[PDB]
Nucleic acid binder design. Structure first.
Lengths: 89, 203, 201, 250, 53
RNA sequence: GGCGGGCCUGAGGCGGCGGGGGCGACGGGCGGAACUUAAGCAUAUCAGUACGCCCCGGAGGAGAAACCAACCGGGAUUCCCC
RNA sequence: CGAAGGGAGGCGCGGCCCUUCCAAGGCUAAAUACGCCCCGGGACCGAUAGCGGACCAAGUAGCGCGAGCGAACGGUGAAAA
RNA sequence: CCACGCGCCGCGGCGAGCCCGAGGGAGCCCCCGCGGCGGAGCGAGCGCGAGACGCCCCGGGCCCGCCAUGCCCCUGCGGGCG
RNA sequence: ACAGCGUCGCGAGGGCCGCACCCGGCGCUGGCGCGACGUGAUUUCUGCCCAGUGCCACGACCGUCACCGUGAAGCGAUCCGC
């Protein structure tokens, strides 16, 4: 176990010090991305995932993504962005 | 204003535009010597992030570092000893190619002081880093308080003492907290303190 | 002795005894160190003769459920606590209060502790300005040691009514305590049994 | 344990070539604009003996097209070259023993020496005593010419490559028996330190892999694998066949 | 002290005792040899102080 | 194809200023053993030691948390006690 | 091979949280360490000891091609009378 | 021989306590001064948790934990009792 | 050791060696050459044996035999194929 057993672990009152506010890229950063993607285009690996999203399918797309990106959480999100381009292309 | 955009395009290195630009550059850098002086920082945005300012006394030098693993210096390949020290070519070096780059220019120009280095290009056999060196006796550098610290005697040949950014990473200093507790003052200094037998007068 | 019943020694073998870095640290300089630190302390005191050598530091609960009852001195007062007294961090440092933005009170009771400490210090402090005022400065008296030293009060017995107290405690408190402790294990095992029951028909 | 004599030969400390008093590097004249579009006159000033080579080298003096000088080039001397002979080099060069002309130009069946493996290599094949290369055929479409090297093996060479008409002099030298150990000592003084040769089965176990036992025997098959490590390759290497059989033309 | 010199036991067979001897053949590096290290050299690691309650 | 300028890369020369080498310690970076212990000996241990090389400074390194924790919680680093 | 909100929470993996922080740029005094050298003290050794070396000339005289090695040697008397 | 670790013995102080730790006190052998160790064990662990005798010793008996077993019942794979 | 005698590899985009690496030697060489080995001038001859062990074969392509890469399955670590 990693917490003592106290029936009433609340002699003091917490200060609710925390912030839901999460780092947001903002339209300032988003505008840069739109202008940069406009000219530079997608990456060769990312382009391949877009084809798989319309062909071999999502398990295959995630497998290709995970190998390249290296994190399941990152891979799923990259897949989600590439999916919005590919599916709505 | 322009910098937040250049940064995004340098993140997209595998883009067609930058793949052409980098193939023209690796070509030139294979054509030139290992360390050559650059008039402008090739990447101004990355240099400014690492501390370059366009004032007299700040110099940029581009260095070529051979890619690959390490071969132990040995005669006829034979390392005489316990079998755990037998390997001669499989070992990989402890200091990064970025760290090696700064320590090369440090010997070539021992008068100048290296603030930081950055990645400029790479092909199969070599990697190119650009190092920011500062002249510590320049009139402009000496009277500018932001970079006066490099003019201080302790900050001399930091490349050699691993005080540079890449040298610290190799010493494990970049990471703190658990898992880096036994490598803080130094890996040797921690070792001496942890291994010291303190004979107290009342003990 | 020679074999027989001896617990095995867990002292590590000496290293670097003949060659290498000195792994023996002698303490014959210890008495001399004491005189040195006092002499450095005396010299520093004179440099700021009216001001105390130690800055005001905050009372802070000692960490862990082991020492959670007691309080010790921390690096600096939180911005919220200084705001409660009404002092900005820079103004507070001039008065002598160390400020730590990193610290978060973690309670409303912690803030009250320190705000009261800050309030008392403000009364105890006297700001000698007016350019040079030598006569007031001569009798200023420098505070010596830690400022407002933290006091940890000992437990004192109190009087309570068994009848009212028996109202909060359930009868058979042990059953209530042992049930709460094992609820997770009891609940998981009974879910494990529900799956087995579901997986029979 | 010790490094074998083959391993020690690579370093070159005492096993290097004795290049003292060697006349120079015998090579064909450089391909240039005058050779490509015409002929370059030469005269044979002198035929001399190189210390290492058993073949005579000839100092032929051609005019310097670049300057006002007369260039001196050391050539392998094909048999019959005479002091005073005029030699012509180029695409339009004639067909007399001595002339250097593109291999394609030379007719099939001629004996040619100092042939170039690839054009403008300034000399590569058939440059030893009495060794000639025969022109076998000329592929007009591929501009490739087949030639029989003095080993018998046939190689295809670009017709653009140059060669000298004739068979190298000093031919029939091997025919004479050396006869004495002394005429051998005097022979390799000019070349490297590669004589006298000690048989490995005479050397102790530590010096040579054949080594030494109570009786002088190799003790293992002389034939050694192609992938033998540097110190291991001492016996006959990659031997397809061994022994004196006869009828080996098949 | 006594370790500063370089002495090696000459060895058996030379009719001399096997104790480290210098170039000259002078006995060295032993508690019994003149100029040798003391067998157990005094050190400051000793406890010079005794605790009292 | 010749000719003037601007830029951008490069050369040769002059000045002004700096670098180099030294100290049996401490301090940082790197390369790196073996004897030894295991009652043998390979992993291990010795030892992240000797030694080699390379940099400082009066100290050096470290240093203001992509920290620890799990609480009636602390709060840069360094040294000490445990 | 390569991201984007990421890091961590001392048993990996995929979810769901909860606490905590912001890497890939830089500076910073103090408390700490320590030899030569100088100063002072010692339950230290007393000339085969104590540094190799107390001797006006010790890393000296000598030795080894060289790297390197490496000694011996204190005392007249109060006054040289 | 010395240092450190261990086992046991003898002594001295104090006793459910005990303790020149580092340190700090115009303080020198004086003063103040935490951990630690002991006072509870046992079970891999979740966890649970000793009184019944007794000059002393020694066995016996019981109690606590761990491994079972069978009963009873609340705040239930929980509790209690054998 | 030697002359003599055979066997062996190699046509330079190559062989055989040196070699922490950068780079070298043979080689200012080129098959009447260079390296590797045996036997040891003549005179006279060298038989039989490819089982085994070597060696050699775009000599094959069966059976085996890796990384990758690519199939399925999975929440993914992964796991089975090919």
């Amino acid at each position: 176990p990693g917490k003592v057993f106290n029936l009433k672990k609340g002699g003091a009152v917490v200060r609710i010090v925390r912030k839901k506010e999460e780092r947001k890229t903002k339209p300032h950063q988003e505008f840069v991305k739109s202008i940069i993607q406009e000219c530079t285009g997608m990456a060769p690996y990312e382009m391949h995932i877009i084809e798989l999203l319309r062909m071999n399918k999502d398990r295959h797309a995630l497998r290709y993504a995970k190998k390249r990106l290296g994190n399941i959480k990152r891979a799923k999100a990259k897949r989600d962005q590439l999916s919005v381009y590919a599916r709505n292309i | 204003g322009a910098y937040k955009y250049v940064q995004e395009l340098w993140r997209k290195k595998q883009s067609e535009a930058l793949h052409y630009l980098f193939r023209l550059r690796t070509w030139e850098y294979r054509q030139l010597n290992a360390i050559k002086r650059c008039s402008h920082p090739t990447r101004p945005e990355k240099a400014r992030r690492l501390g370059y300012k366009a004032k007299r006394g700040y110099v940029v030098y581009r260095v070529r570092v051979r890619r690959g693993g390490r071969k132990r210096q040995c005669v006829h390949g034979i390392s005489y000893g316990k079998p755990r020290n037998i390997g001669i070519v499989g070992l990989k070096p402890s200091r990064s190619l970025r760290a090696l780059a700064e320590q090369k220019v440090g010997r070539r120009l021992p008068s100048l002081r290296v603030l930081n280095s950055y990645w400029v290009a790479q092909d199969g056999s070599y990697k190119w880093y650009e190092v920011i060196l500062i002249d510590p006796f320049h009139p402009w550098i000496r009277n500018d308080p932001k970079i006066n610290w490099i003019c201080n005697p302790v900050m001399k040949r930091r490349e050699c003492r691993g005080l540079t950014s890449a040298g610290r990473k190799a010493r494990g200093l970049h990471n703190k907290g658990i898992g880096a507790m036994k490598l803080r003052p130094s890996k040797r200094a921690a070792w001496k303190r942890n291994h010291t037998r303190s004979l107290r007068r009342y003990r | 002795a020679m074999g027989r019943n001896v617990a095995f020694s867990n002292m590590r073998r000496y290293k670097c005894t003949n060659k290498g870095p000195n792994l023996i640290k002698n303490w014959f300089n210890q008495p001399a160190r004491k005189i040195r630190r006092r002499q450095t302390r005396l010299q520093k005191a004179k440099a700021i003769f009216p001001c105390p050598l130690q800055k005001l530091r905050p009372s802070v609960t000692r960490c862990s459920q082991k020492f959670n009852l007691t309080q010790r001195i921390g690096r600096g007062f939180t911005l919220r606590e200084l705001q409660g007294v009404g002092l900005s961090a820079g103004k507070a440092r001039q008065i002598g209060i160390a400020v730590d933005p990193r610290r978060k009170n973690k309670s409303e009771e912690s803030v009250a502790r320190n705000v009261a400490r800050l309030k008392e210090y403000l009364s105890k402090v006297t700001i000698f300005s007016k350019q040079a005022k030598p006569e007031e400065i001569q009798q200023a008296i420098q505070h010596q040691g830690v400022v407002m030293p933290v006091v940890n009060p000992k437990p004192v017995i109190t009087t309570g009514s068994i009848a009212e107290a028996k109202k909060e405690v359930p009868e058979n408190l042990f059953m209530y305590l042992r049930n709460a402790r094992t609820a997770r294990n009891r609940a998981r095992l009974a879910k494990r049994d529900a799956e087995r029951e579901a997986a029979a028909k | 344990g010790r490094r074998i004599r083959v391993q020690r030969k690579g370093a070159g400390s005492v096993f290097r070539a004795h290049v003292a008093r060697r006349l120079g590097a015998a090579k064909l004249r450089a391909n240039d604009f005058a050779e490509r579009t015409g002929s370059v006159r030469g005269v044979v000033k002198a035929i001399l003996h190189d210390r290492g080579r058993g073949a005579p080298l000839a100092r032929v003096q051609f005019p310097n097209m670049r300057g006002e000088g007369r260039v001196n080039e050391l050539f392998i001397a094909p048999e019959g070259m005479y002091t005073g002979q005029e030699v012509f080099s180029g695409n339009k060069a004639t067909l007399h023993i001595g002339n250097i002309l593109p291999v394609g130009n030379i007719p099939e069946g001629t004996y040619v020496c100092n042939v170039e493996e690839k054009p403008m290599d300034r000399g590569c094949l058939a440059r030893a005593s009495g060794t000639y290369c025969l022109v076998v055929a000329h592929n007009m479409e591929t501009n490739k010419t087949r030639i029989r090297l003095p080993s018998g093996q046939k190689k295809l060479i670009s017709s653009k490559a140059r060669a000298m008409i004739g068979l190298v002099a000093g031919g029939g030298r091997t025919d004479k028996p050396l006869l004495k150990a002394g005429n051998a000592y005097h022979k390799y003084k000019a070349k490297r330190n590669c004589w006298p040769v000690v048989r490995g089965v005479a050397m102790n176990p530590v010096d040579h892999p054949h080594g030494g036992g109570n009786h002088q025997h190799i003790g293992v098959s002389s034939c050694v694998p192609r992938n033998a490590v540097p110190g291991q390759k001492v016996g006959l290497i990659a031997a397809r066949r061994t022994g004196c059989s006869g009828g080996k033309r098949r | 002290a006594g370790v500063q010199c370089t002495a090696h036991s000459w060895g058996p067979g030379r009719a001399v005792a096997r104790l480290p001897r210098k170039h000259g053949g002078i006995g060295a590096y032993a508690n019994f040899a003149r100029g040798g290290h003391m067998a157990h050299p005094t050190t400051v690691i000793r406890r010079w102080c005794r605790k009292v309650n």
